[PDB]
Amino acid sequence: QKRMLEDGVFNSEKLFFEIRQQGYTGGKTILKDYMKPFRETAKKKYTVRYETLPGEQMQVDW
DNA sequence: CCTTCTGGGGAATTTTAAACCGGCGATTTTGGGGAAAAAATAATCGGCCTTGACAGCTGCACAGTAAGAGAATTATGCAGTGCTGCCATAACCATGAGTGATAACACTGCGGCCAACT
Ligand SMILES: [Mg+2]
Numbered sequence: 395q396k397r398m399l400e401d402g403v404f405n406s407e408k409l410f411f412e413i414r415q416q417g418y419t420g421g422k423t424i425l426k427d428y429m430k431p432f433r434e435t436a437k438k439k440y441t442v443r444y445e446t447l448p449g450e451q452m453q454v455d456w
Numbered sequence: 457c458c459t460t461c462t463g464g465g466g467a468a469t470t471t472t473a474a475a476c477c478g479g480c481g482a483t484t485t486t487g488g489g490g491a492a493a494a495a496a497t498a499a500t501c502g503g504c505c506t507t508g509a510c511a512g513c514t515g516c517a518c519a520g521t522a523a524g525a526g527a528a529t530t531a532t533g534c535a536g537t538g539c540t541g542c543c544a545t546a547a548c549c550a551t552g553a554g555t556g557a558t559a560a561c562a563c564t565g566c567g568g569c570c571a572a573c574t
Pocket residue numbers: 455456
C-alpha cells in the first residue's frame with residue numbers, strides 16, 4: 395500500500411518481485427486481486443440517453 | 457258319515473355374524489453421543505484472452521473573484537522628565553537557637569621513594 399500510494403507503482407510484476415525477496419511465496423493472482431481496487435477506474439463507454447420534458451431544459455455553450 | 461292328515465300363526469329359544477372396545481406385542485420415534493462423510497465457502501494457483509500505450513512535451517489564454525505583497529499614512533503605547541508626598545527599610549540593642557568548629561581515634565587518599573623491565 396505504501397508503494398502504491400507514495401511511489402505510484404502499479405506494476406504487479408515489480409511489486410511481486412520485490413515482496414518475493416521479503417519472504418512471500420504465493421502467486422500473483424492474490425496480489426492482483428488485492429491491488430485492483432487501488433487502480434484507477436477506466437472511463438466507461440456506455441452512454442445513457444435522456445429526453446427532457448417540453449419547455450423544461452435548455453443547454454448553452456461556447 | 458267319521459277319522460286322519462296337513463297347514464298357518466304366535467311364542468319361545470339358539471346360533472352366528474357383525475361391530476366395538478380393550479388388552480397385549482411390536483415397531484417407530486425422539487433424544488443424546490460419537491464418528492464419518494459430504495458439501496460449502498474461502499483462498500490460492502495457473503493460464504488464457506484481450507487491449508492500452510509507446511510513439512517530443514505541456515504551457516499558456518481567458519474568465520472572475522479573492523488574497524496578498526509592498527508602501528504610505530495614521531493611532532497609539534511606551535518612554536522620558538520634572539516635582540511632591542508617602543511608605544519601606546535599615547540601623548541599633550537584647551536574647552535565644554542553630555551550626556560551624558574543636559578534640560580524638562580510624563580509615564583512606566595522595567605524594568615521595570624504591571625497584572623491575574625494556
Ligand atoms: Mg464550454
